[PDB]
Design a binder for this molecule. Structure first.
Ligand SMILES: [Ca+2]
Ligand SMILES: [Cl-]
Ligand SMILES: [Cl-]
Ligand SMILES: [Cl-]
Lengths: 4, 301
């Protein structure tokens, strides 16, 4: 979903 | 206005009705935050927890300033959503229609409302009087201006803020209200204040920061969701470095920045331990954040  | 078991039950019925409308397969809601199909039942559940914690002391609950405002707003927002379906009709089923966009913004508002309620009644007991604002200088302002109050009318908030951070105009004030009043009820809660002051830190230059990052920045997207950002950046898929940013809805108080990569993927990340200005400068340098909302000019921060 949210990555780095 | 005082709240009893009855007004809660009436709100619960309005919430169930919204959920029935939002269950229509033609809407095709995606199970992804904010997801109204889980938000409303979740708000009902937390309201049950609260009621449970106040058994035999409903009198106390009914008089709580924040709770009365919250319930009034919950009723207004649920009625608004019902009126939206009634007036929009088939237009609700065209993704990209203005009435469907109105529903998405409402879904975000219900998300913010539940996060607020949980922040002020953690475990179901009121703790607004001891809410902890994250930035020390903001916590000092709130205490100075409002003591231990949990909520204040917008007019009173604006006047208090102006004395420390000058607001230049009425339209600036209306843009500020639009930004901080997440629950869209014309009051500012200590929770909303904590969110805004984390997003637009540092406090020393609060409204200069917000003006720079939101009022005049083409990248800022107010009341936009994760899925909308992916859809909006789709038109820029062959333009690496196109980006936009918005409030994260699941980690309130934090920014989500979406951007187009060199290999044509759209990623979204939440910066770790860095205010927005620094996240934007760092991503600008690396070529991730070049073209705000796909436009050629990027503000020089
Ligand atoms: Ca509000
Ligand atoms: Cl809009
Ligand atoms: Cl760390
Ligand atoms: Cl341009």
């Amino acid at each position: 979903r949210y990555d780095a | 206005g005082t709240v009893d078991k009855k007004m809660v039950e009436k709100c619960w019925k309005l919430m169930d009705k919204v959920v029935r409308l939002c269950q229509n397969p033609k809407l095709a809601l995606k199970n992804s935050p904010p997801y109204i199909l889980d938000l409303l039942p979740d708000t009902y559940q937390h309201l049950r927890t609260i009621l449970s914690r106040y058994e035999g002391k409903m009198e106390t609950l009914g008089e709580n300033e924040y709770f009365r405002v919250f319930m009034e707003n919950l009723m207004k927002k649920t009625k608004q959503t019902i009126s939206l379906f009634k007036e929009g009709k088939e237009r609700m089923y065209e993704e990209n229609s203005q009435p469907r966009r109105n529903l998405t913004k409402l879904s975000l508002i219900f998300s913010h409302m539940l996060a607020e309620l949980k922040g002020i009644f953690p475990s179901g007991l009121f703790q607004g009087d001891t809410f902890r604002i994250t930035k020390a200088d903001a916590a000092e302002f709130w205490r100075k201006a409002f003591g231990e109050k949990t909520i204040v009318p917008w007019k009173s908030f604006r006047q208090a803020l102006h004395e420390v951070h000058p607001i230049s105009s009425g339209l600036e004030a209306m843009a500020l209200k639009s930004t901080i009043d997440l629950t869209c009820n014309d009051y500012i809660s200590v929770f909303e204040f904590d969110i805004f002051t984390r997003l637009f830190q540092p406090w020393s230059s609060l409204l200069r920061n917000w003006n720079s990052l939101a009022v005049t920045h083409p990248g800022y997207m107010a009341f936009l969701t994760y899925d909308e950002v992916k859809a909006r950046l789709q038109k820029f898929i062959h333009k690496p470095g196109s980006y936009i940013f918005r409030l994260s809805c699941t980690r309130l108080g934090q920014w989500a920045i979406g951007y187009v990569t060199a290999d044509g993927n759209i990623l979204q990340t939440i910066p770790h331990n860095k205010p927005l200005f620094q996240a934007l400068i760092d991503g600008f340098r690396e070529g991730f954040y070049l073209f705000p909302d796909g436009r050629n000019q990027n503000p020089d921060l």
